[PDB]
Write an enzyme that holds these catalytic residues in place. Structure first.
Site, PDB file in Angstrom:
ATOM      1  N   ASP A  15      13.066  -2.280 -15.970  1.00 19.14           N
ATOM      2  CA  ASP A  15      11.635  -2.015 -16.056  1.00 19.14           C
ATOM      3  C   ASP A  15      11.312  -0.531 -16.236  1.00 19.14           C
ATOM      4  O   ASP A  15      10.408   0.012 -15.587  1.00 19.14           O
ATOM      5  CB  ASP A  15      10.937  -2.595 -14.825  1.00 19.14           C
ATOM      6  CG  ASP A  15       9.442  -2.811 -14.993  1.00 19.14           C
ATOM      7  OD1 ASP A  15       8.995  -2.998 -16.139  1.00 19.14           O
ATOM      8  OD2 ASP A  15       8.729  -2.811 -13.972  1.00 19.14           O
ATOM      9  N   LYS A  54       5.517   4.079   1.196  1.00 21.71           N
ATOM     10  CA  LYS A  54       5.032   2.765   0.757  1.00 21.71           C
ATOM     11  C   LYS A  54       5.227   1.734   1.847  1.00 21.71           C
ATOM     12  O   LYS A  54       6.345   1.554   2.307  1.00 21.71           O
ATOM     13  CB  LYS A  54       5.750   2.302  -0.511  1.00 21.71           C
ATOM     14  CG  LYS A  54       5.416   0.864  -0.924  1.00 21.71           C
ATOM     15  CD  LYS A  54       5.802   0.542  -2.353  1.00 21.71           C
ATOM     16  CE  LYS A  54       5.255  -0.805  -2.742  1.00 21.71           C
ATOM     17  NZ  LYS A  54       5.529  -1.154  -4.161  1.00 21.71           N
ATOM     18  N   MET A  61       0.839  -1.216   0.000  1.00 19.61           N
ATOM     19  CA  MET A  61       0.000   0.000   0.000  1.00 19.61           C
ATOM     20  C   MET A  61       0.867   1.257   0.000  1.00 19.61           C
ATOM     21  O   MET A  61       1.948   1.236   0.586  1.00 19.61           O
ATOM     22  CB  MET A  61      -0.909   0.002   1.250  1.00 19.61           C
ATOM     23  CG  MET A  61      -1.742   1.275   1.452  1.00 19.61           C
ATOM     24  SD  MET A  61      -2.861   1.170   2.894  1.00 19.61           S
ATOM     25  CE  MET A  61      -4.071   0.076   2.279  1.00 19.61           C
ATOM     26  N   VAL A  62       0.376   2.357  -0.644  1.00 18.16           N
ATOM     27  CA  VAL A  62       1.066   3.659  -0.731  1.00 18.16           C
ATOM     28  C   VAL A  62       0.123   4.786  -0.269  1.00 18.16           C
ATOM     29  O   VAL A  62      -1.028   4.794  -0.680  1.00 18.16           O
ATOM     30  CB  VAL A  62       1.575   3.948  -2.169  1.00 18.16           C
ATOM     31  CG1 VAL A  62       2.695   4.982  -2.159  1.00 18.16           C
ATOM     32  CG2 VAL A  62       2.028   2.671  -2.872  1.00 18.16           C
TER      33      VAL A  62
END
Length: 340
Positions: free
Chosen positions: A139, A44, A28-29
């Site tokens: 990425d 985070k 979760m952030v």
């Protein structure tokens, strides 16, 4: 311990007035007010300890981001965790709050040439540094490129980063790959583990193309569609480029496809600056040996108004196992943020 969406977000004391943001890939952030420095930050929550694989990505990313200090790479401001391994169930990573990211920007905002140029410059400046530390990001994509209100760009999310390993880059045809499909270089689908620097430059090329039209350039719907998207623009590989692919499954795959001619860049992008398209061509080269390097992309005429090698730093300190041991490494890695 303050709650957010019924989940323990235990960051108080220093971090108050929470507001939810997302559930990301995993963890979760939220944003929050830092009471020491007098600005709002992003935090985070990570809970990796029950899985070996999530531990290795949390550890990779902590170790890399604490080693790195660069204006175009996100810094870790603070790491909140329990004082003891036994009480440590979560880790909270505090970062500077960034208004937005380039994925969000692109879906709603047209970029002027001056913004595309400035963002590409900063992407490449940050990438110079990463590469100089013998790291590959692996990425790069618009959502991993954070932007603040003054358009300062920072590269984030080193969860899939590796130390470069070009001697062991080779693999078989159709080798499964974790990084985001649309930014994968052609060689990943053919014969590459993504252990050379040329894989990031491909993704940068994709991002550039995306900036020029607000649409992904190669929006493949599956592993091998991604390659047919590429070759529909680039055209069939040359014989000389096929002769670099020793792998026969990969080579025969390419030989089986119908001939496609190169689609000129200035037909895809009739609004684009010509120097931008020339740099885009050099980044989106099929053959990774011939693909432009980070430092050459910086030296390209397109970026001439920003290029300054004395202001494009390199890393001082380049880089060269069960769950239980990685938790201990994570604990040691985060110890510097603890009272003491």
């Amino acid at each position: 311990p303050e709650m957010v969406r019924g989940q323990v977000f235990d960051v108080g004391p220093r971090y108050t007035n929470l507001s939810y943001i997302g559930e990301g890939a995993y963890g979760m952030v939220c944003s929050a007010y830092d009471n020491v420095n007098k600005v709002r930050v992003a935090i985070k929550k990570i809970s990796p300890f029950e899985h070996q694989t999530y531990c290795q990505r949390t550890l990779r990313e902590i170790k890399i981001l604490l080693r790195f200090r660069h204006e175009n790479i996100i810094g870790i401001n603070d790491i909140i965790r329990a004082p003891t391994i036994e009480q440590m169930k979560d880790v909270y990573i505090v970062q500077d709050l960034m208004e937005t990211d380039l994925y969000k920007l692109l879906k709603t905002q047209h970029l002027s040439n001056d913004h595309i140029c400035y963002f590409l410059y900063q992407i490449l400046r940050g990438l110079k540094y990463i590469h100089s530390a013998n790291v590959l990001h692996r990425d790069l994509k618009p959502s991993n490129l954070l932007l603040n209100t003054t358009c300062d760009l920072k590269i984030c999310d080193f969860g899939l980063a590796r130390v470069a390993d070009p001697d062991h880059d080779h693999t078989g045809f159709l080798t499964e790959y974790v990084a985001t499909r649309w930014y994968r270089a052609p060689e990943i689908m053919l014969n590459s583990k993504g252990y050379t620097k040329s894989i990031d430059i491909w993704s940068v090329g994709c991002i550039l193309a995306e900036m020029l039209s607000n649409r992904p350039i190669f929006p493949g719907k599956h592993y091998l569609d991604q390659l047919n998207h590429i070759l529909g623009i680039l055209g069939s590989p040359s014989q000389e480029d096929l002769n670099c692919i020793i792998n026969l499954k990969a080579r025969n795959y390419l030989l089986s496809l119908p001939h496609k001619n190169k689609v000129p860049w200035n037909r895809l992008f009739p609004n684009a600056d010509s120097k931008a398209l020339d740099l885009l061509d050099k980044m989106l080269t099929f053959n990774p040996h011939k693909r432009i390097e980070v430092e050459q992309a910086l030296a390209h005429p397109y970026l001439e108004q920003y290029y300054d090698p004395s202001d494009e730093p390199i890393a001082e300190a380049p880089f060269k196992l069960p769950k239980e041991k990685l938790k201990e490494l994570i604990f040691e890695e985060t110890a510097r943020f603890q009272p003491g």
